[PDB]
Enzyme design. Structure first.
Site, PDB file in Angstrom:
ATOM      1  N   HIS D 132       0.835  -1.199   0.000  1.00 38.49           N
ATOM      2  CA  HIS D 132       0.000   0.000   0.000  1.00 38.49           C
ATOM      3  C   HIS D 132       0.872   1.253   0.000  1.00 38.49           C
ATOM      4  O   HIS D 132       0.498   2.251  -0.589  1.00 38.49           O
ATOM      5  CB  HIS D 132      -1.032   0.029   1.149  1.00 38.49           C
ATOM      6  CG  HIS D 132      -0.442   0.108   2.520  1.00 38.49           C
ATOM      7  ND1 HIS D 132      -0.110  -1.014   3.253  1.00 38.49           N
ATOM      8  CD2 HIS D 132      -0.152   1.173   3.306  1.00 38.49           C
ATOM      9  CE1 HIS D 132       0.369  -0.643   4.426  1.00 38.49           C
ATOM     10  NE2 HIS D 132       0.356   0.677   4.484  1.00 38.49           N
ATOM     11  N   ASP D 212      -8.739   3.620  16.902  1.00 40.06           N
ATOM     12  CA  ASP D 212      -9.217   2.238  16.880  1.00 40.06           C
ATOM     13  C   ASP D 212      -9.890   1.892  18.199  1.00 40.06           C
ATOM     14  O   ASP D 212     -10.957   1.269  18.230  1.00 40.06           O
ATOM     15  CB  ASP D 212      -8.090   1.251  16.599  1.00 40.06           C
ATOM     16  CG  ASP D 212      -7.603   1.304  15.165  1.00 40.06           C
ATOM     17  OD1 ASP D 212      -8.290   1.931  14.337  1.00 40.06           O
ATOM     18  OD2 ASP D 212      -6.524   0.728  14.875  1.00 40.06           O
TER      19      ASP D 212
END
Ligand code: TTP
Ligand code: TTP
Ligand code: TTP
Ligand code: MG
Ligand code: MG
Ligand code: MG
Ligand code: MG
Lengths: 481, 492, 481, 492
Positions: D132, D212
């Site tokens: 990525h 998160d």
């Protein structure tokens, strides 16, 4: 000398400038570790064990944050690191004058113990700040960090208590008027003191905070209003401003004026009054003072904290027996019984002159019911509570200046018509609570009849539980229909 | 005046209390009655973290609110075990007994909590053996008898002499094969709720993790509500015991990791410990001169107040301020130490080190360590000579709650496929990233001489001492004692 | 089949009964994972990425919590585990009928795309619940857990949408009337749906919640009101009840009716309208539907979610060019420009009939100023916003019943006079926002002149930035003095 | 129209954005311009935790908001280093460049984030090597050129060809002795802010820990604001590098412990991983039939969209729903796997084990493991025989971010007494309760046959396999395979 980093649960990791540290690390400041922020509130809200000390650090920190941000965005304001320090110091020191159980002391005890005087914690903070400065050799340390003690000390005191007497301030001129709006805002009550206590009180009380002070800071500017440079809020933040005051009112309603918290304050005050002749506090030159006279000597006052409650509770002296016995009733949770609450109707206003006469009125009501006991004036407590937006009858938003996106240097006004029809129509009211010192079932039943009858006679509002506590009394009043 | 099935409906109303940690809690009237006594309210005047407040300004919380929380959580846990497993025959009486033990576990704490039985009493009265837990038993007894609690207990279905005994056992452990008398083996799990002597998994931790964190400004990472949902009671040997779901073993290790982190960051803070030390010193110098009136008018000292619960009731953090505000010339030395605390003129931190390998510093020898430091011979040219009495050597035992032992070796688990079958999980079976050992010692050194020259000297003595003893190289060794560290090439 | 434990950031670890799991694990329910709770709000509040799915789990959980607590305290109510399940299921399924971007869909798009129909998400939930039940063989699973499908299915639908037609409900009798107050409270708006979204929306938005639902539950009882057993609140919690609605209004004001969030909803709706003829969604028996007609077939509707926005954005079909180009303007943040806001004065009420005529009015205003451009009706958007306490002109607290400490089984009423004079005098108002589709500096300047002139002509309130955006127009109106 | 010192005052107004994690953030117009592009807005449609949302219902957050946070924190850190140390010559240009790299670090993520480059691309196109991060470089270039960003950069004091190169280096590392060209050695610390290749201490972690946690319902225990206050820049070799205060070493170890806990509890959840696997399978079966239109009208597959940034721009989580809602019979197999996800008919978890000692499963051999499991010969009487294709064997590498290495060995520290002097701290010097190793492997086994008999069989094959390979005894071994565990007395 270097900075300290300190961890506050509310504000996180904060930096303390060595000058602030030096002020913090004195008997006069450390004293605030032994005075509870909410006084008797801790006896109702078990999380509310926080003291004035940590609140004071927070105010000092936020004061610096606000001044720094205004400066970063607008250098033309000529805010110096000296100004920042002076505002931080006033923030730290605003509460130095609080006594045992904070507002209980200047709000309840002193007015009863010494009616001839006029005393406020703010005046105390001035006196205590002076005492702190002189006793700890702070002036040379101030000079070391670019402050000019005679000017700046005076500035700091003005920020705390207001004008010491046309531009009425001497510590700073009109083009730094906004510096007087940071710690204690006398014009409209928007200041960092609130911002700290909203967050801190909420964290401890178990009530969630709904005001966002960091948003306010981002939407704050300084604009010319008359000849003064003043703090202005972005126009579309007016809704959030009203909510700020709504949050304040909610906190007073839920916590600060709790019906039982107020009774505990009352009981503690009673104990103090009965102890006041017998407790000795040593002040300047070995001279002796009472709880009520300790305010006249800052050396004695330094030693006057919540400790006094325990000194009374743990005492053996037979002359403290009456005082001690009231505190023991608090521990056994044998408190004065709440009878009910009501309000004035229309535009009627209960004057403070008359507060003392109200228990006699309640006892003099003539409820046409069968009772097993007769109650006297002294069996009743009538606690009148002023609930408002911080400026009596006035709307604080009428005293706020705003700026628009298209012209961010142009101050404007926003009226109540321009905002929202769902807002309050009035900004002050009174709440009347009645309690009975006789705690048995028969006295309480009687007290209720006297109370509701009193409400009827005075054209006060129908108590919420009126039909249940005094079913024979409520039909009588068809206004209550 | 409402009826259902022809019988009158009776509305019992509980007291609701708002705790910032647990939210709105219901208090059973029996609990209220116990709470509203001088013996219990006393806990409002004893700080949870003692001197920690002088380092962490949020840590103003007292034992009182912590005790309410433990009592509440104890009831929550028992109730949940019962709802899931009716076969356990948990009664509302059992619930109450566990709640009461939860409330009353801390009744015996003294001024500044662990400072008192951890530092002061051992120095003030070395001949005795005293623990706050024993104090809680004595204080609970005193609370019961002084406030006529037994008939109130009976009124709510308790059997006082069984249940009082049960409550005390829960607090302090066995009072003299199955060693408990308050409840039998098939309710063994009730002894694991408030104070778990087997593996340290109990609701006391669960409260203080959350509450200490809320106040300290450190965030809690253990989830007690998750644990409860994954907890069951299973036969282990002939006892019915609390078991955790097998796959929660990772979360269990983390629970103890959280505990160790809190001790590391907050409870054993190098400056918090020095403040505890200084306060203890003040107390020691005041102990001959302060009088506390107990039963029958008898006088007690700070150090002897523990012998009379009536006197002890009046012994709280107040003593710190009584000393600070005193005028008596005989308290001058005590008072002066507390004033140094206020002016932030504290003993200076010198450094820290540890033993190497599996060497263990014996508690016998703690007293001899300042002499050792002062006897070191650093090859540095110094302006001052320091003596034994100038040094403080604070040895700190950091562990998982059971000395050298791994608590998870003493935990039982259950699997999804057989939820009534207790099993064991070994350390091999879990994760190789876990700790290899479960206990260690930290040695902190401080100097009572606070000027720049003494501190520079103290550092040289300290690092030299470390080298001589084969202790670990202090983290700042090369910076605080650059002339001393090269000699030791194990430190390379 | 066993229970599942699920971790929700708002409610913590929740237990899901296997029957609930079975309903949850269907295409019809899982669909809610792809529909954002706040629609276009995510394009203003970057934390607001939460979907209807997790909100629905929360409502279902809270519904069970409330019913369970009422039952524990009052066994005489005869609440069964079957009742609990039925209320949990209605909680879970209340939102099954929401479309793309939630309220955008039934609030904006459907009324414009298909004016002849009358559609609400609640009706959709009924249809979708039926479809869910039949397509997944739920009835036998219901029976397995003690439910009676024909009764209980009907009950569940009533809870969601209200009466399906004197006691108007069939699923449960009057002595369980309180069960209809839990998920969706048509009488006074106090229900667990709000309780979840207050907390969840706040967590995601970055605005703090001030309402305490757990406190409410502890102070809630069931009392006889007429022939119905109804949920009653403790009398002294009336202040907290008003604050509950204040919280609701604050959330609408700050977030749900954000001036830019509304414009994004408008733009997305426009794109959908221009795509509606060309997008095909396959439903029952292979039949084709449009975005606007998918509501007629639950099989097609199942496949109609926020995905449609991206299908349009990623499309290559030249017939979607106009639709696609509007969405691209959203991505480039080339949005319609906000012009200003105003309100009606006195008791004037803008009727929905006339909403369509308002852009023509604005364009027809004749500001006596020099302008470089002339704007047309189609250049203006006029968004009228109804802000109220959930019951139009009415005060919800007038429809709440209370109980007192001394008589906890006795229902009473509390009037507004009996509470606080700082509360709102009225409970509904309208906000009028105006935007301009022409985005250059000259058009925007013109739009402002038209707008303020329009406000003057209509006797509307002076815009807050009126003197700055239209200085030549405001002196004209001395009502604005 | 206001003046000061005779010059006109110009009011620049920044955009304020409210993030639930960081509160009210200011966005510089240049950042806004980059943000408001199809290439950046794309991140609104890619979930941070991929399939984690199907286990943790709060985890609906997307890469977009995470990217804003990283960009914000990157600026916060750089600004703070600069305020404390002006001698570092950090310019507002440097600040912007670091903010931009922060914003743009994740531009290259594909559908379901790490699922895409971690699972799908390696299976769909084994010949290529794709990350990525590389994607972010390509996508950043594409964003810059397609939106005319360079002149806007120039307008705000940036030098595009230097700074663009700098930004890319920060994201992906060196692009081909001091290996960086965008900035010299005396600004080495700027390369440590967004993505720290040396020791993994960077602001990317700081954001995702907090974000998160907020969404998952797990509480964060790392304090990034504390770290910033205790961070300085010091000479290490000839580079100026970010150094931590010595006594924060404990908190540093805890930072990595938090990271490992999050991977353990959430990111590597046994069911979350199976959902990622199933989604990947669907994608693989759809890859021949789905068309994505890129540059010049060229067609691409899911697997080839990475070669054209224009196509890739249109490749997001949408693909999952395109597959789910499709009618094309050629997508039937793909579509059917996604439907199994919706009906919660997932591959069944069989169990978990680890290698013993320091044995390491090589990535070469991952593919051969299902055959091994199926080839095991458990002495249990079974109703079914399972094949290689019925098993999934998921090997999970758990580590501290640097394989076998201890990140703290690659951290430099400073002491209170000498804050400009960089030092090292070894593991011996800190705490014996820390991990002995920093990497391990977890092996999870699943079965694609979901009935009760197959699952019972799979368990027998699995535990037998574990015994044959000398792997650790599964935690539920004695319960899932009671007939198999006695044979291995190492498991006693
Ligand atoms: C060590 C530590 C302290 N704290 C708190 C306690 C204090 O309020 C604040 C600062 O504490 P320290 O950083 O421990 O301050 P110190 O004065 O002990 O260190 P030194 O003089 O050696 O630099 O942070 C934490 O929150 N977390 C931690 O891990
Ligand atoms: C009024 C009020 C109290 N509290 C707190 C204070 C206490 O800890 C707890 C209980 O408060 P109350 O419900 O006010 O308890 P009370 O005993 O004063 O009322 P009564 O006897 O009339 O039933 O809740 C809130 O959290 N919010 C509120 O709005
Ligand atoms: C109105 C409002 C917005 N927000 C959020 C939404 C956004 O993320 C951020 C900025 O919102 P706004 O300040 O409303 O930004 P705007 O661009 O709509 O206003 P203008 O252009 O008129 O200056 O704050 C709040 O958090 N609270 C509020 O009360
Ligand atoms: Mg220090
Ligand atoms: Mg009460
Ligand atoms: Mg499962
Ligand atoms: Mg804007």
């Amino acid at each position: 000398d270097t900075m300290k980093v300190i961890n506050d649960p509310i504000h996180g990791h904060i930096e303390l400038h060595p000058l602030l540290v030096r002020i913090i690390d004195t008997p006069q400041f450390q004293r605030l570790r032994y005075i509870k922020q909410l006084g008797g509130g801790y006896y109702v809200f078990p999380g509310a064990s926080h003291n004035r000390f940590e609140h004071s650090l927070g105010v000092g920190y936020l004061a610096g944050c606000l001044v720094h941000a205004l400066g970063e965005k607008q250098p033309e304001l000529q805010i110096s690191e000296r100004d920042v320090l002076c505002v931080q110091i006033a923030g730290l020191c605003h509460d130095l004058g609080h006594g045992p159980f904070s507002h209980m002391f200047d709000g309840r005890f002193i007015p009863l113990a010494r009616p001839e005087v006029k005393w406020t914690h703010e005046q105390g903070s001035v006196m205590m700040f002076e005492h702190l400065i002189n006793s700890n050799g702070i002036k040379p340390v101030m000079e070391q960090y670019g402050l000019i003690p005679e000017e700046d000390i005076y500035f700091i005191k003005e920020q705390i208590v207001g004008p010491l007497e046309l531009w009425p301030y001497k510590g700073r001129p009109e083009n730094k008027s906004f510096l007087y709006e940071i710690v204690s805002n006398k014009r409209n009550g928007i200041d960092v003191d609130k911002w700290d206590y909203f967050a801190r009180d909420c964290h401890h009380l178990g009530i969630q905070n709904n005001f966002d002070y960091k948003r306010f800071i981002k939407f704050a500017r300084v604009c010319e209003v008359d000849n003064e440079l003043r703090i202005c809020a972005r126009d579309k933040e007016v809704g959030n401003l009203y909510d700020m005051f709504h949050t304040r009112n909610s906190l007073h309603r839920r916590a600060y004026q709790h019906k039982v918290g107020n009774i505990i304050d009352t009981m503690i005050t009673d104990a103090f009054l009965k102890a006041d002749d017998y407790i000795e506090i040593t002040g300047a030159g070995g001279k002796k003072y009472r709880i009520s006279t300790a305010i006249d000597d800052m050396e004695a006052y330094t030693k006057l904290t919540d400790n006094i409650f325990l000194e009374i509770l743990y005492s053996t002296d037979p002359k403290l027996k009456d005082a001690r016995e009231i505190l023991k009733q608090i521990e056994y949770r044998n408190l004065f019984k709440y009878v009910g609450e009501t309000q004035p109707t229309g535009q009627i206003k209960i004057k403070r002159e008359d507060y003392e006469s109200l228990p006699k009125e309640v006892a003099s009501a003539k409820p046409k019911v069968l009772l097993d006991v007769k109650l006297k004036a002294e069996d009743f407590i009538v606690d009148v509570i002023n609930m408002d937006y911080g400026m009596q009858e006035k709307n604080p938003i009428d005293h706020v200046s705003f700026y628009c996106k298209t012209a961010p240097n142009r101050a404007i006004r926003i009226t109540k018509n321009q905002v929202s029809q769902l807002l309050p129509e009035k900004f002050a009211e009174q709440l009347i609570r009645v309690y009975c010192k006789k705690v048995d079932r028969k006295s309480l039943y009687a007290a209720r009849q006297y109370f509701v009858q009193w409400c009827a006679d005075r054209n006060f509002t129908k108590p919420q539980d009126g039909d249940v506590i005094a079913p024979l009394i409520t039909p009588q009043k068809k206004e209550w229909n």
